[PDB]
Design a protein around this nucleic acid. Structure first.
Ligand SMILES: [Mg+2]
Lengths: 254, 470
DNA sequence: AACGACGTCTAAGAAACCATTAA
RNA sequence: AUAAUGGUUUCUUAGACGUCGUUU
């Protein structure tokens, strides 16, 4: 038999990564990251861990404080991600920054989850057209971003929430489309506007929206291929990721 | 393939049983076509009824009663609702109206009490007004209470519930009670309200509207749930309780206990130790033994919302004999997964998405200890319109169904039994007029009884049945 | 290494209110 | 409270870790 169930999970193929470890609490490291705001990612563990460039660490830490810098090999990335929560967030940021590189896609964070917002100024692009057909009614095209009626100084756009999960020794990336509301402190005022927007997004409409978002995020689907992405390809401590394009699916037993 | 998950399967549908042993998946359609299960035994031979209304609200009760007697037609939903033929036609039992000695009026001081905003005082006054009808316990079966909207101030606040308070206060006096608010009178579609109130009154008069078919006699299903009460001194009193569902010999049993049997006193994490778990499961074992004839359950399907600790697992394993297998599945609602339906190659077009969501009763095994179950989806054969279009119950709320997740802590083998049992237990609720519920009835009854117990600290310890809190 | 006492990360729930009414 | 569950925002709990201490 051929009934099919299609999920919103894409596989992650990389198993091990290399990163910088600096040898000399979490709150002070976060404070230093906030004040410095460098072009690198950092986290606190038994030893302070980072991914990026050495000058960023030089700005972060005084020259008399860094005892040494070494290379840490995080083998079996799924097990390490499952074991610790800090490594989960670090891999989150690494794979996401590798994903959203060299693309006209915004980036916003609410409730400790990551989104991929479509910019207002770059709404009328060629890549942003296949999503406008799925949002559109019948053969017409849909507005991918705009304003909300009876809501002064409050905009809206189409966004997708990106997460990562570990299930049985495998790493999956979760995609789920919502509508992003700016500013963030007044999202409730558009709640009804969201409902009336998604009231008629049935199986086929949601399927097409998901396919369009996958195309926008990756650029190529089909052929059983995978996309290689890079986070910070301008330093010794770089991240290289390989992500599948076909979403996880299943077929009936028959 | 790099992303091909494990093969999925479907368990078709629960089949409800009606009078003269007739199988029907549609509850309302089977009720209208066949008769209720209890009408075969004529256990509620006559559904007597009494009123309890403020000084001038008797007319609303009379009007809803007359609407219950007369037929009605569906207005809002049409692919699921069936025409309501009136109480006598569908349930074969009258609704003889209360006489002059059963149409009591509440004290005029109830409004004065509600003016200040004292929920406990108003509940006590309502119960005291009710107390005059305990003499005529043979003159009526179900009492109807109308709560006017003018009391809306004393309805819910700071963790207080008038509904649970009076349902617990009345419980020692063996008398089912039904509350009718302005919502039931004002709601535009009258067929739904009539169906719901009729089923509630018939089930609370001692009857069995419907019961599931193909149920194994030697099985048990237990579910625990907890409620949180904030104390003055920064405390988090967690009150847990349990509910079991028994097929018995020929009836239906739906009871619910309290865990605070002179033990526990948690005031902390919603988890119980070895002693508390053993004591709680001892009552379940005793009740299963007593309701049946000197026999133990051949299986146990204990469920709850949170996860079992190792001490809890040991207590569950030791509270029962070695001839029984205990599944300790945990139900998780919030999930980051969802699914979409894709149809196969039919005619000449390639694969395409369907116009309706994925089939209800479909499960996907992710790991060896976790699975996804679809309690929401498309049901076939429930369309009162053209009989080829599936029905999605929550199409007006969510455009797509949200799956539930099952995390097993014991057992082995496939997920057929657990998923089939959960989906079957989702349809046996009698308080709701829709097709099913998201969660199995054990969790929902445990949750509502936990709220009831938390509302009244001084709740007497005997075991109540479903009809007294439904 | 003696057992608290205090900070981060995550995953899960429960009160307490809003809303509309099945391609 | 005839009823279904979709949002929003808080709070709590449980794990995982770290840091002086502290006891001894
Ligand atoms: Mg009820």
């Amino acid at each position: 038999s051929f009934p099919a169930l299609r999920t919103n999970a894409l596989p992650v193929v990389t198993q091990s990564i290399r990163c910088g470890v600096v040898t000399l609490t979490f709150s002070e490291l976060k404070e230093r990251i906030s004040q410095k705001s460098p072009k690198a990612l950092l986290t606190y563990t038994e030893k302070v861990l980072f991914l990026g460039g050495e000058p960023e660490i030089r700005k972060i830490f005084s020259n008399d404080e860094i005892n040494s810098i070494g290379q840490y090999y995080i083998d079996e990335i799924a097990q390490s991600v499952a074991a610790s929560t800090f490594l989960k967030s670090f891999v989150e940021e690494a794979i996401l920054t590798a994903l959203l590189r060299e693309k006209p896609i915004l980036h916003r964070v609410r409730h400790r989850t990551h989104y991929a917002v479509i910019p207002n100024a770059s709404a009328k692009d060629d890549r942003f057209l296949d999503l406008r057909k799925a949002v559109g009614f019948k053969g017409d095209l849909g507005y991918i971003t705009g304003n909300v009626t009876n809501a002064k100084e409050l905009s809206w756009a189409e966004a997708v929430s990106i997460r990562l999960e570990e299930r049985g020794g495998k790493l999956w990336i979760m995609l789920k489309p919502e509508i992003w509301i700016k500013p963030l402190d007044r999202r409730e005022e558009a709640t009804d506007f969201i409902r009336s927007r998604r009231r008629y997004r049935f199986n086929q409409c949601s399927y097409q929206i998901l396919d369009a978002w996958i195309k926008i995020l990756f650029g190529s689907i089909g052929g059983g291929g995978t996309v290689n992405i890079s986070c910070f390809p301008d330093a010794e401590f770089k991240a290289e990721f390989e992500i599948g394009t076909r979403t996880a699916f299943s077929l009936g037993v028959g | 393939n790099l992303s091909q998950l494990a093969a999925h399967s479907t368990i078709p549908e629960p089949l409800l049983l009606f009078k003269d042993n007739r199988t029907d998946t549609h509850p309302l359609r089977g009720l209208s076509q066949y008769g209720p299960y209890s009408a075969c035994f004529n256990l509620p031979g006559q559904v007597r009824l009494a009123y309890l209304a403020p000084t001038e609200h008797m007319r609303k009760l009379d009007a809803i009663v007359r609407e219950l007697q007369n037929p009605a037609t569906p207005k809002e939903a049409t692919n699921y609702y069936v025409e309501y033929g009136g109480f006598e036609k569908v349930f074969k039992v009258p609704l003889v109206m209360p006489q002059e000695h059963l149409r009591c009026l509440a004290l005029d001081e109830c409004h004065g009490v509600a003016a200040n905003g004292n929920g406990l005082a108003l509940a006590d006054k309502i119960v005291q007004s009710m107390s005059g009808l305990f003499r005529q316990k043979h003159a009526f079966d179900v009492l109807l209470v109308y709560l006017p909207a003018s009391w809306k101030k004393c309805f819910e606040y700071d963790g207080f519930d008038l509904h649970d308070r009076i349902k617990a206060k009345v419980a020692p006096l063996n008398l089912p009670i039904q509350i009718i608010n302005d919502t039931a009178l004002t709601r535009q579609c009258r067929a739904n309200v009539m169906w719901g109130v009729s089923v509630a009154l018939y089930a609370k008069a001692g009857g069995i509207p419907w019961k599931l078919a193909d149920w194994d006699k030697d099985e048990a299903y237990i579910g625990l749930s907890y409620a949180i009460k904030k104390n003055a001194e920064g405390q988090e009193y967690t009150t847990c309780c349990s509910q079991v569902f028994d097929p018995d010999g020929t009836g239906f049993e739906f009871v619910a206990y309290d865990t605070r049997e002179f033990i526990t006193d948690r005031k902390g994490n919603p988890y119980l130790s070895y002693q508390e778990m053993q004591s709680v499961l001892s009552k379940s074992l005793h009740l299963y033994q007593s309701s049946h004839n000197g026999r133990m359950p051949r299986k146990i399907f204990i469920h709850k919302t949170t996860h079992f600790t190792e001490d809890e697992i040991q207590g569950a394993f030791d509270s029962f004999s070695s001839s029984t297998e205990i599944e300790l599945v945990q139900i998780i609602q919030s999930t980051n997964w969802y699914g979409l339906k894709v149809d196969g190659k039919k005619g000449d077009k390639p694969v395409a998405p369907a116009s309706y969501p994925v089939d209800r009763g479909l499960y996907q095994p992710l790991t060896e200890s976790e699975c996804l179950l679809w309690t929401q989806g498309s049901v076939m054969g429930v369309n009162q319109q053209n009989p080829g279009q599936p029905v999605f119950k929550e199409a007006a709320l969510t455009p797509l169904p949200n799956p539930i997740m099952l995390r097993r802590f014991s057992g082995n083998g496939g997920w057929h039994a657990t998923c089939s049992s959960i989906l079957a237990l989702t349809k046996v609720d009698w308080n709701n007029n829709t097709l099913y519920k998201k969660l199995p009835v054990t969790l929902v009854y445990s949750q509502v009884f936990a709220d009831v117990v938390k509302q009244t600290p001084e709740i007497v310890n005997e075991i109540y049945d479903y009809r007294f809190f439904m």
